[PDB]
Each structure stands twice: as structure tokens, then as C-alpha cells.
Predict the 3D structure of the following.
Amino acid sequence: RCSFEETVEILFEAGASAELDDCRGVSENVILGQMAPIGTGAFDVMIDEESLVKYM
Amino acid sequence: NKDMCPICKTDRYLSPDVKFLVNPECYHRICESCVDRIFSLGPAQCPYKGCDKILRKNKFKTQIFDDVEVEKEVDIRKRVFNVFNKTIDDFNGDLVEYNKYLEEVEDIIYKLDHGIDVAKTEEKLRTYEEL
Amino acid sequence: KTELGPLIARLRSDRLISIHKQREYPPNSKSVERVYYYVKYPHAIDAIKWKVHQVVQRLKDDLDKNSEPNGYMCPICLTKYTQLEAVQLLNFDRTEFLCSLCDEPLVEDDSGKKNKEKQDKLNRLMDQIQPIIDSLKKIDDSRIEENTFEIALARLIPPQNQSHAAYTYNPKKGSTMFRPGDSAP
Amino acid sequence: HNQFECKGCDNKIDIYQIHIPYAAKLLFQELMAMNITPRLYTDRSRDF
Amino acid sequence: VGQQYSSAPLRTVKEVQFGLFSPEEVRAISVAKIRFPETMDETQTRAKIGGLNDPRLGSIDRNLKCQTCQEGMNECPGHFGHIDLAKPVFHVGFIAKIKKVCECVCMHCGKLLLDEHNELMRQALAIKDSKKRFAAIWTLCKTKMVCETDVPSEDDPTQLVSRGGCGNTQPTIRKDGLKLVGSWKKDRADEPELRVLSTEEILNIFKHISVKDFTSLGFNEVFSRPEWMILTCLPVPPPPVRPSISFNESQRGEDDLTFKLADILKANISLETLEHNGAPHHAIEEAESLLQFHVATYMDNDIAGQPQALQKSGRPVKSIRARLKGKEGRI
Amino acid sequence: RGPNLNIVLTCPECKVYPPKIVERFSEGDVVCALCGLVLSDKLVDRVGEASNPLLDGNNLSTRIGKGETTDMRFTKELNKAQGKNVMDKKDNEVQAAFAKITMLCDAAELPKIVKDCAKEAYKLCHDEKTLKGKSMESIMAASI
Amino acid sequence: MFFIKDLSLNITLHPSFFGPRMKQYLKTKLLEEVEGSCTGKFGYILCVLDYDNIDIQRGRILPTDGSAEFNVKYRAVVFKPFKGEVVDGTVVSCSQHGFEVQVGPMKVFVTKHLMPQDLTFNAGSNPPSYQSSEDVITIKSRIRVKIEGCISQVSSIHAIGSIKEDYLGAI
Amino acid sequence: RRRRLKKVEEEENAATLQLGQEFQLKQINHQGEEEELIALNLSEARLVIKEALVERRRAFKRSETREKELESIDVLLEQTTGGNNKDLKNTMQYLTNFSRFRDQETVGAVIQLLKSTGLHPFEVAQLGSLACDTADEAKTLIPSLNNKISDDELERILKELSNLETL
Amino acid sequence: KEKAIPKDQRATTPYMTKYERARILGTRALQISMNAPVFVDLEGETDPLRIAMKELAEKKIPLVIRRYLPDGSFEDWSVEELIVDL
Ligand SMILES: [Zn+2]
Ligand SMILES: [Zn+2]
Ligand SMILES: [Zn+2]
Ligand SMILES: [Zn+2]
Ligand SMILES: [Zn+2]
Ligand SMILES: [Zn+2]
């Protein structure tokens, strides 16, 4: 919300209300500099041990 | 001057939690706060003006009776009776023998308390417990 | 007035003296606010009791602190290091403790010989401060009534012959306003 | 010296490192000066 | 080259919890105490110890280390100081919120003016979301002008059930400048009674608010308590937040925040000296207002109705709020 | 008498001390001139105030003035409170002398440096035992 | 003191080991990265029990690094020191500040203030030793030390002990 | 799980049997079942470590007095362990030179002996690690034992421990 | 693990998405560029991305895509079993 308008007023209200931010949107992750859960980031890429043995 | 620690002088009024402990070796009253600060590391000389007998923190115990002299009598009595223990049947009903034995153990306590002859009495106690 | 300021301010800070400001309306001059000073015994006794305990407690804590090992310090950066903290900063040869900021040998701290001096300090204060505890013991036995500006006026001995200040408490008629620390049981 | 400490918490074993933009670090510190405390936690408290 | 290797685990931020700094937390977090309003010593060679640019707070020079972590400029994140204010001051951004809370709770015993015994209050307390619950509570409790030591029983009107109260009539609080002024209405025998609600007085009441009382108002016990909206200890941002720039490197310039912090220290020291000796009540009040203005302008220089802090050149001082807001702000 | 807190950039590989260091400002790098190893990257090149270190020492102050919206009542009291500062009073005397030096120099159509030297000369020689029984007018004229 | 503790670790594997025998590499990494390591939480991790039954969870590829992060659950024996514990060890070295014993993977420092008054440092004897009427403390000697304090860092543990109490010191 | 802020934590002290927030009496294994804290004395720890090393050696290849024993452990440790084994090497050397019970039979009896006291797992491990001749020595060396076991039981336990150990 | 939907009750599409293909190709290309064992025969290729494309065509990428759900539950889909039709 602070990324749009009333940046300081919103942040003060969150401090008084002790708001908890779960960092789901693009704005939170962009602020924190981490891959947002969008597009290619909407999933996790894991390593399959069951398949490594069978490709050789 | 009957409700304060002689060393730290922590009056009960300002420190209602103060608790006093006594040591069998010299039977001196010391508050719990002083015991930890001076004996936690290990044995040390008693913190009294004219007392140079070493003591350990583990030996401290709470005083039962309000008279220090009786405490010495009772604890010495307990130590003596731990070795000199007998009953009427031990002498097969010989009350005369039992009465003499009671005096002997009673006399031993008297000498040990007042230290008339510490060496002979303590040596006497040492030999009997093995039997 | 300048010399009186420090005395009143410090006494007010310790709550040995209470203040009371009320609007006065002299019949012949424009109204001016007057300041009166008195003693609220529950406040002063409460303040005295806490301070006596704190001073005694501080010495006892300080006496206990002095019984612990001395410690260590760096002569250059003047940074104090505890025994635990100094152990992990020693050199490879394990012969002398080394500082972090300075990489210089440390120096053992003082206060090793004060084990008796602080005990003497505590002994003197308890003997000197005896009358306070005795007075407090009697105070606790009885019950004191909290003093107020109006109540204190009952024992007033006028200081001057024609003092300008009116030593009267005429509370404003039916006023619901309440000021901090201006009401007593 | 491979030593970490958070004075005021009396802990030296519960430290984590996070990669954030220097602007993000500046923002939180500025919020800290404004009496607002932003706390960065590495695990979820409430259920998703 | 990059940053040095660290043995701490590397994670990703999953949640951000906001709140307010407690006075204790600021002192514990702080690495040094700032007591001198200067930045450099008399020789202008090294930063003065205990000053604004204390070496313990960090370093912004490429040739100097940090006295705390002994790490370079690119590795030191900065360390926070703290200033012990002589008297409590309001947070400029929470003055409006403080006013609403003051009306909600009694100004003598710090208890909510309306309890669960009122049907309307029960509906207001039943609201889940904190923000609207606080608004509903404020609407019902702002009109109450008496603590109601005794309240009629819900079951029947004949009998009255006693509740925690003191019977003192509540004031009609109004915001004048940076001060909260309360007024009292007296029963007709007229003119109302007017006096200024001291920040210390309001802080005392906020400390008396029960845990259940301010949780209903939307405050969090662990993180955000109403008492912490009043600043008693001021954290000092590290030098990185307020770097010192150089134009030709023979002239030294300081950030706007540094001067504001210097002003706070000068005002704080002046108030301490005044209250220490003499300082009639009139002099104390003016000094306290000066400290409030500097702290408010330091956090926010754009306050309606208040004068603006101006630099030597005359331009307005750039505050923290100005840095964060706007199209060119931090966000 | 204080912590070193000094960093010297030397090439770990070349080991030659003192080293040949070239500052690539455009690339923002500090690179060894012999081997090319980079010793420091991410080099750094209104949000400030113009400060003069010598004639004013270390004195930071801010003025209070009107804004786009402001009530005259608040401005007057704040200025009154600011003036009654015991610590800032001592430095105000030097500033007051500087103001009079500026007026005298400006009225004389003298260059800026002449005014600067007069102000600096007063500061260096003020607050000394020898010059205590001399009129301030003579002090200012001698500095000018 | 020695404990059998259940521990978990996050192991990162370079893609060069993303082969059919990657499980063996993880097991090798655990031994080379856990055994012989020190942690302030669980203490010195000495040996890994049930090496053949280490639970390896599915690996997650790091976005930028490209390496797979594996959560590994294993059972290992850890030596965790405690304050107030009584341990026996060998005096590895001696110096003016004090002599430190070698207790398992840890070294306990005995300060002069934590030593009895009778013992005094003597640098004239080679090797240096603390000499008293009843016993002499020298390198390789056996000492019963009571840990009077422990400081635990994320990857280091240091302890200080005393021998002033009874039934302590030379064994 | 929500109140993450600082809470007053009990100091790590062995005398009070406060082992910390991670070494509590009740422990949860990887499966999830509740288990008791596993505390090993010097003899038990030596056997457990060696039993794992010997099994480890078998896995690779397949797919006595103190002096000679010390050499035997030395060669085994290097063969069946990887790099950075400095800490483990000292541990095995320390355990052999300080362990009191050699084989499983004596170690098994010791466990079969002290478990009847019902003491804390930390206390029982201490008793099997430190050799005490009198009840007073054990009480002072292990303060937690105080007011938990009477001197009558403690005296016989130590006596039986001494008669169950030979070198 | 209540957040791991069993393979028998997976309700997501059996087709690889463009984002999944892009990340899988990029994820494996980075591994190839960092000397990862290539499981496909190369008739001459030096670009890691082109090698990954060859592996995807012949279904020799040993990765599983963990598709997350708005409630936190996830489903594991192997690249081999995912249909690449886009
Ligand atoms: Zn005492
Ligand atoms: Zn004595
Ligand atoms: Zn130093
Ligand atoms: Zn730093
Ligand atoms: Zn009320
Ligand atoms: Zn070079």
C-alpha cells in the first residue's frame, strides 16, 4: 500500500497496529530484492533423485 | 543487633527475604547472601573477626533451636549416638550396667562439648565405630 | 531567587517538598498566580524509603561484584574484557591475551584489593544510617494521614506581618477539573 | 573472528544473513529513526 | 572483490512485522550514547567520542574502519545510538492517534469510558478487524464526558452495578499546535476550565491502560503499546543514513538530519540544565516546547500550522518523511 | 592514543609494499597496477548544508521560519525560546563580532578574502588573557 | 558431556554432482562438513551414527546459485559442555595467565584467580609448571576441572574452569 | 510461535540440571515419537563412537591394554574418517585414556546398575564418568544429587561401581 | 506432510506452462554452464541453452516442478511426465 500513496502515513499506522506483512505481492518482494511468486517464480524447481538414476 | 548479618549488616527490615544459616564447625550466623558470594567458588576462611577455621558451603544448615549452645549439645549428641547406640536388651536386662553405659556416653558428650580432652575423646569415638 | 531555585528544584525532585499553584485575586491589584510549598509526609517517607533501600542495595551489589574475578582491559582502546571474553582472544602461542581492535597484549584489571574496602564502606553506612531505619520502623507501626494544601493551613504560623500572599484556599465553586497529584485520600 | 552477537537479546547463535537492496536497508534504518520498528523474519508465523 | 564469507545461514525474508520501539529496546539496541551536539573534536581531525559522528556508530569513509565490528564501509551496516530526552515528547505522526485514544480512555484512571455493560459497546467490541473496531470504539466513547463509577445493570434499570471508575468528568480534548489541551465543563452555579495536558501526564495515563483495554483499541501487547507512541528515548540513525558530502574536499558539509539531531541535543541539554536549577515554570514550558518542535521537525518538517525548520541558506530542512515520500523518494 | 581503525590496500598476490594503485573512477574500481587484481569494487563518487570548518569550528544550528501554512503565534514563541539558550550564547558573541566585521568590511568595498581574514583573525586571537582590557572596536580594526 | 542428538543440516550441492551417484556425494559432504565441526547450539559434533540410514529429503534448486539445497536428517554424538560440570582432562599447555586442560574436543582455561592460593607459577622450571607443597601441575598432568563458565559462539565454544573446590585438581 | 521477542531464559547451569532449551529431558526423534535425553558416560560414549566407526569401515570395504589399543583406534580412525578429523582424533584418544569400563559386558552392567536410582540422565552419566570413593565426593562433584538420593544408597552404588571395573 | 497432494489426486494441468519451460531450460542451462553431467548425446553443441533444449526434447531433465496452491499445498510434477505442447 505504501508503494502507491501516503507512504509515511500508512507505515505509521502499521507500526501502531503492529501489522504483519506476509510478502506475497510483487511490491514486497521488489522492495526486499527477492524473486516474487509471479510467472517463472510461481513454482519451485527441485531435483528428482528417482530420475537421475534412470538417465544413465 | 539481633536480626542483622554481622558481616554485610543486611537488616531484615530493608531485606525481608534475608535468611540466616549456621555452620557446625564454629556455629556462627551468616546470611544466605554472604554464603554464596564468599563460598561459591570453594572453601574459604570463616568471615569473622577471630575465626580462622575453614568451612565448606555444602555443610551449612538451618538452625533449629534459638540457643546456640544447645545446638552444639544436640549435634554433638547426634554424632555420639550415631556410634554409641545400645538398648536395655543389649545388656540382657542389667539395668545397673545400662545406667553405667548411659552415663559413659553422656559423659563423653560433656567432655567433647567443653573440650576437656579433645584428643582422647575423639580418638575414643574413632575406635568404637569400627566395632 | 536565583539561589533559592536550585534548593527548591532538588527538594521537589526528591519529593521532600510539594508545590501548589492557585489563582489569587487581590482586591487592589491584578490577579497573579502564587506558589506555595509544604511537606506531604506520605510522599517524603515513600521517597526516603526507596532511596535508602537503593543505596544499601547498590553497595551490596557492588560488594558482590568486587568478589568476582578482576577481568582484563586493553591499554590502547580502553575496552574491558571479561574472563570468558578474554579466553577466546588469546594468541596462537597461548602466552598472552590479545586485543581485537588493537591486537595488543592486555593488562589485568584493578579492584583485586578492594574486597575489604567495600566491606568497610557498607559497615560505616549501616551504622551511620541507623536513626533512619529506627524512625521508619516506628512510622510503619502507626498510620499517617496524607497532607494537603488546605490541611497544612490548619497548622500555619504566619511568616510575616503583612505578607502579600493570601494564605487561604478558596476552591472554585463546583469545578469538575482535576489536576495531577492534587487530590489525596 | 567468525563471531556474531545481538546485544539486547543476549544471543550469539540465532543469526541469519539476508540479501536485500541497500535502499531497503536504508529504508528500514530510516524507519527505525522514526520509532517504527520493521522486523524481518525468515519463517511464517500465521498460516498461509 | 565482494563481501567476505559469513558462517551464518542464508535465508529469504518471509514476513515483515512492524511495531514501535520501547524505550528499553532502544537503549539495549544502541551501541553508544550521544551526549555532545558536535560532530568533530576541537582539532577537526578525528570524530569526537560521544558526538553525533561517533566512530562506534559506524563509518562512511573508505579509509576508516568501524570501532564496533572492525569492518570496512562496504561491510558495516551501521550501528544505532540513542539520546535520553529530558522530558517525554509526542511522536508527530501519532498525535492524532494519541488524541483519539485519550478520548477513548479516562484521563484519571486510564480505563475505557464504556465497558461491556453497554449494548452498543458490545457490538463495537465484536468487530474483528482492528481498524474499524477502533473507529467504532472511538465514536461511542468520545461523547462520554464522565467516568461512570456506577452504571445501570443490564438486567434491570432499578439497580445500578458498580464498575471500575472514579467519577471525574472527562475533558473535551483539542489539538492546538503540537500540544493537546483539555477543557472541563462545570455545573452551573459559566466559564470552562482550561489547562494543557502535559506529555508526562498523558504518558502516565497510557501506562495505566490495561492490556485488555488497548488490545480492543487495536494495539499489540508484544510490539505496539499505546505508551510507546510517546518518545522518551530517541534512537540516533547511523552515519550511513546521514552521510557527510564534500564538494571540493577542502570544505565539509553535513546532512540535514545531522543538524536536526544537533538541535535536539542542544535543546535537550538546555532543558536538563534549566530543570536542574531554578527555571521558573514559564521557562520550563517554553524549553519543553522547543524540544518538541525540533523532534517533530526532525521526523516531519511539513506540519500544518507550524513553522518550518530552515537551513542557513533558508531552504526548508529535508526531514525523514520528505525522503520517503514523493516520486523521488526511497520507495 | 586511540584505536588505529586504518585500512591500507595492498595486493595480496604481488605483496609489494607500498603498492602501485590505480583508481579507475569510470569503472569504480581500485586495481593493482602490476597484476590487475581488483582490491576494492563498488567505489562511491540538496541533502546537505554548507559548513565552514575553521571560522565556525563545530557549531550546528537551524532557523525557524514560516511555511506555506503557519500561524504567527507559534513562530514568535519558538524564536523566543531558541534565543534563551545558555550554551549557544557563548558562540553568539563570536558570531556577533563576525557580523560587525562583515558590516565594516562591506562598507569599505573590500574583497571577500579581506572580510574572511578579519573574521578568522578575531577568532584566533579572541578569548585570550592578553586582550581583555582592550575595546572591541580596536580589536575589530586591528583584525581588519 | 556426551549426548546422542537428532540433528538436521542444509547441504548445498554443486551441479557437477547431479549424477546417478549424487546420494553418495551428499553422504560424503555430511562427514566432511559435520564431523569434527563445532556448533554453539549442539556443541562439538563428533561422530555420525547410522551412516547408512541418513534421511535425505528432496533437493531444491537455488534460483540464482543453481545448486541444490538438501535437508539432511541424521543421528550423531555431540559433546556439549555445561557450567557447573565436573570433567577430567590433560594439561595441554601452561603459561603465566594459567594452565588449560584438554577435555575431549574442548579446552578449558584455568585462571590464576580460579586456582588455590598455595599454587604459584614458576617459569624457571622447564617446562613451566605450577608448584605447591602437595602437588605440581605440568603439561601432560591429569586435572579434575569444574567448568565455571561457558561462552558459545555459532561455530566456537570456550570454557573456563576452577580447581579451588575440594576433590579437584591433580588426580 | 507468534511472540518471538526476547523472553527471560534460564541460565545454562549443570548444578540446577538446567541444560538449556535444546537439551531438555524430553526429546523428539526424526519420526516424531517422544524419547528421553540420551546421556552417555565416558565408557558408553567410547563404545558408541567405536561401534559406528567399525560399521562405517565395513560399509566402505564391503561396498587389550591402553597402549596398543590407542594405536588400534588411531589407524582405524584415519581409515574410516575424512578430512578435518582433528577434533575426533583427540576425542578418541581422550576417551581411551579416561574410560573406566572397557567392554560391553562391564558397560552393560553399569547401565543395568545405575538406572534403578531414577536420577536424571545427566546425573547417571556423571556418576559413571567420575570415580568417587565416598558419598560426600559425589555430592560435591555433582551438586544435583543432593536431596535426591540418600547417602545409604549412594555409598553402595559407588562401591559396586568400583568392584565392577577392572583394567 | 498434509501439503503434498498425492500423485493420484493431482488436479493441475498435465501440460508444461511457458514459465515452467522457461525456468527449466534456464535452470538446466546454468547447471550445464557450471559443468553438470549432460544426459543427452551431443552431435556438436557449445551453447548451454541449446544443450538444455536438446535435453527437454528427449526428456532427459532430472527435475520436478513443485506447483504451489493458494493455500500452501503443492504438487510435484516431473518434467518427463509433463506434456510439452506449447
Ligand atoms: Zn550477610
Ligand atoms: Zn566462624
Ligand atoms: Zn585494544
Ligand atoms: Zn560497524
Ligand atoms: Zn476514570
Ligand atoms: Zn598485484
Q: What stands out?
A: Residues B 26, 28, 46, 48, 51, 53 surround zinc ion (ligand 2) (CB under 6 Å). The two ends of chain C are 34 Å apart (CA to CA). DSSP finds six helices and five strands in chain C.
